[PDB]
Structures are given as C-alpha cells and as structure tokens.
C-alpha cells in the first residue's frame, strides 16, 4: 500500500535469501520442525502436496550430503513460496486449543 511496508518486504526477501533453504530448492514449510501439530498437518495434506514435499526434502538431503546447491535458476523464489502447510497447521492448532479450553471447564 505504501513505500514503508515495501522495504519491510525487502528485508524479508533479504532474510529469505540469506537463510538459504531456497538454494536447496526448498520452501519455508519444508523446514518447519515436526512436532505433534505439524505431523498432523502433514498427515492431512493431499497426495500431490505430500509427494512433492517428500521429493523436495529428498532432493535437499541429497544435495546436503554433497555440500552442493542448485543453480541459481532453480532456487525457490521468495515470490513463489507457497505456504501450503500453514492452512492445515492453523486448523490443527485451532482444534487443539479448543480441547484445551474444554479441559479446564
């Protein structure tokens, strides 16, 4: 909407490229630490996203073993990073918080 919230994105694009998981062809949600909430969200993914997530992670563990990265052409662009897991994950948390609010009635 403005120029101030636009360099805010510029420093988030900066941190994104510095974090460097896009150099392994990975997306932000591929790097989330699996807890009980996350393991449930992954369980709920449709077959296409689950299989894609499996291969991207497998491709990255392969690269990490060789201490290599993908060509710059194949890095995950900050603009094209689909937060595919947070919708499922946010509903998992929402359900858990409901149980927790009932548990103290």
């Amino acid at each position: 909407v403005s120029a101030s919230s636009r360099w805010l994105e510029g420093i988030r694009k900066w941190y994104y490229n510095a974090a460097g998981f896009n150099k392994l062809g990975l997306m932000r949600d591929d790097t989330i630490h699996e807890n009980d909430d996350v393991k449930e969200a992954i369980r709920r993914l449709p077959e296409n996203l689950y299989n894609d997530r499996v291969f991207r992670i497998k491709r990255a563990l392969d690269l990490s073993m060789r201490q290599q990265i993908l060509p710059k052409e194949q890095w995950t662009k900050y603009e094209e990073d689909k937060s595919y897991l947070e919708p499922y994950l946010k509903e998992v948390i929402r359900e858990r918080k409901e149980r927790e609010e009932w548990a103290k009635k």
Partner: protein
C-alpha cells in the same frame, strides 16, 4: 504453558493438597531421623537421651 489454569485445574490442586503436605511430613521427618538432626529432636520429649 497456561493450559493448566482454569476451574478444573484449581480443583485438582485443592484435591491433592492434603496429600502433598503429608509427603512433605514424610520427607521432613525422614530427613531428621536419618541424619540425627539434633536441633529439632530436643523438643520432642522421649527421644532425648544419648
């Protein structure tokens, strides 16, 4: 973190309170008896001696 503060959890606290204060009596008395802590054992009447 704050899952455990609400109506039911303060009821559980008040249910197990009488028990925990007794296990503190077991431990405290057990600590006095094992180490022969003389500062406490003087006021109790019968054990006074040796």
């Amino acid at each position: 973190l704050t899952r455990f503060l609400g109506p039911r959890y303060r009821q559980l606290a008040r249910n197990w309170v009488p028990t925990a204060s007794l296990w503190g009596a077991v431990g405290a008395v057990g600590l006095v008896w094992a180490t022969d802590w003389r500062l406490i054992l003087d006021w109790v009447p019968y054990i006074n001696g040796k």
